[PDB]
Amino acid sequence: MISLIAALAVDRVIGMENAMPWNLPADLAWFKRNTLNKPVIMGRHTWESIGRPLPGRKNIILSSQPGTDDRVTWVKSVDEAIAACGDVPEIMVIGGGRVYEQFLPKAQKLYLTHIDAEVEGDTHFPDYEPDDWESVFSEFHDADAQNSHSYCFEILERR
Ligand SMILES: NC(=O)c1ccc[n+]([C@@H]2O[C@H](COP(=O)([O-])OP(=O)(O)OC[C@H]3O[C@@H](n4cnc5c(N)ncnc54)[C@H](OP(=O)(O)O)[C@@H]3O)[C@@H](O)[C@H]2O)c1
Numbered sequence: 165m166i167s168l169i170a171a172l173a174v175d176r177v178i179g180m181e182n183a184m185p186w187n188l189p190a191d192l193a194w195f196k197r198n199t200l201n202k203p204v205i206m207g208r209h210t211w212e213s214i215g216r217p218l219p220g221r222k223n224i225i226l227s228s229q230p231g232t233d234d235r236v237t238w239v240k241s242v243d244e245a246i247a248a249c250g251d252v253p254e255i256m257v258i259g260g261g262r263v264y265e266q267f268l269p270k271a272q273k274l275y276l277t278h279i280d281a282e283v284e285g286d287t288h289f290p291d292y293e294p295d296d297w298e299s300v301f302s303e304f305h306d307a308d309a310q311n312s313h314s315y316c317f318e319i320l321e322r323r
Pocket residue numbers: 169170171172177178179180181182183184206207208209210211213226227228229239240241242258259260261262263264266287
């Protein structure tokens with residue numbers, strides 16, 4: 165099973181200048197809980213944005229060019245990325261925009277954080293078709309002293 169996990173600001177913005185400009189510790193904690201002990205697939209730009217391997221997860225990087233770091237696994241196509249995960253129950257695709265576009269048709273589950281923040285960005289989450297997806301979990305949180313925007317955790321499963 166393939167799942168996508170992402171945090172979206174208003175208008176599906178996910179990034180600006182290879183960064184995420186907000187800071188929501190509660191959402192990063194949600195990301196860690198839902199990805200720990202699973203393989204994570206990311207594109208090369210997102211690998212450079214994170215800047216280090218994510219501990220406790222098999223890190224798989226998509227790039228058309230040879231890898232430059234043997235602490236992670238480098239693959240050259242979507243099919244190779246999936247195969248490199250082996251026989252696991254759940255593969256987590258962690259972006260970015262181009263990678264989400266390619267894996268969306270193959271995904272059965274979406275873990276989405278909707279952030280009440282207006283961000284100028286240059287990268288968006290794919291338009292998906294709402295009729296294809298059922299919301300099975302949602303949890304709203306107001307802003308607090310640690311998290312400066314309100315946010316909604318949602319899990320959707322392909323109907
Ligand atoms: N809010 C969120 O949840 C979230 C999550 C992740 C990322 N982001 C943000 O998203 C932005 C990065 O997204 P992006 O769309 O620019 O880049 P990306 O999807 O992270 O990376 C694209 C790169 O991945 C490689 N790639 C993708 N598909 C491939 C394929 N089928 N075969 C081989 N290589 C492939 C290519 O690398 P080569 O050029 O080396 O061939 C391509 O240039 C940043 O702003 C980051 O902060 C946000």
